[PDB]
């Protein structure tokens, strides 16, 4: 579809992203002096149409409450229909945090940049949480840099070139799954590696599932890889138990996912092949730390609080925003 024109002004010139829903494309705006925008074009299929309409309602709400994007939600500029596809026009951002990492060879982000990003992500999502919303699908692909311009220097530690962002400011995009407190809550939310245990065990969820997702994101920014390299539910839980300890008993008694359990324990053989895989790749959380200095212990203190098993006990983003890890921004 490169070369197509939407609503008589937007010429598609590139693909920015892609998904279940359809695609996001970079367009030239022939009616505003040729400067560039992003456009999400949704598939002409019911479930994606409905999500898109819902996204539009959330964006109108958010953009009216915070017209200047103080809280770092993406700004919708307009929306329209075109060959029965819903099209949402956004301010053009830069690469996703996922793509920047990949482009850098999976080198993790420096801790100073991680502090700034984490702050902005928690500030953004806390704004949602303050307005009776849960995002439900937070992940690095959905956090984008405002500008992804970088400098480059040789790093003798690693013996190769590396890219450092000029400006690490982010925005949160994709409100297609975002859910108000009083609306229907889908059975299964989130992308698997960022999915909270209440979701996996179908106990119901709310704002705390986003906090778990953020915890998972921050680990990835720090390591450059997931700690949950899995595509199977029961295995993902064995990995949790290896990194965080046993699942709380009350969660186990409440769940109807009885296939995952034997007596009141995870039905998991450590000596099986999958057992060896987990034992190889996963280890107690604090063992992933790359240094012992206090900045690192505090990041890890936050992470651990975000990866509390019981959503009732998990840290809230209002509490996260005052965590000591954030003081070097003051
Ligand atoms: N570059 C840019 N600038 C503004 C918005 C977007 C954008 C909004 N939603 C997106 C989704 Cl759901 C994906 Cl998967 C990829 C990009 C976007 N991207």
Swiss-Prot record:
Active site residues of this protein: 137
Keyword check for Methyltransferase: no
Binding site for ATP: 16-24, 40
GO biological process terms on file: regulation of RNA splicing
Gene Ontology CC: one annotated term: nucleus
EC number: 2.7.12.1
Molecular function via GO: ATP binding; non-membrane spanning protein tyrosine kinase activity; protein serine kinase activity; protein serine/threonine kinase activity; protein serine/threonine/tyrosine kinase activity; protein tyrosine kinase activity
Similarity-based family: Belongs to the protein kinase superfamily. CMGC Ser/Thr protein kinase family. Lammer subfamily.
Protein name per UniProt: Dual specificity protein kinase CLK1
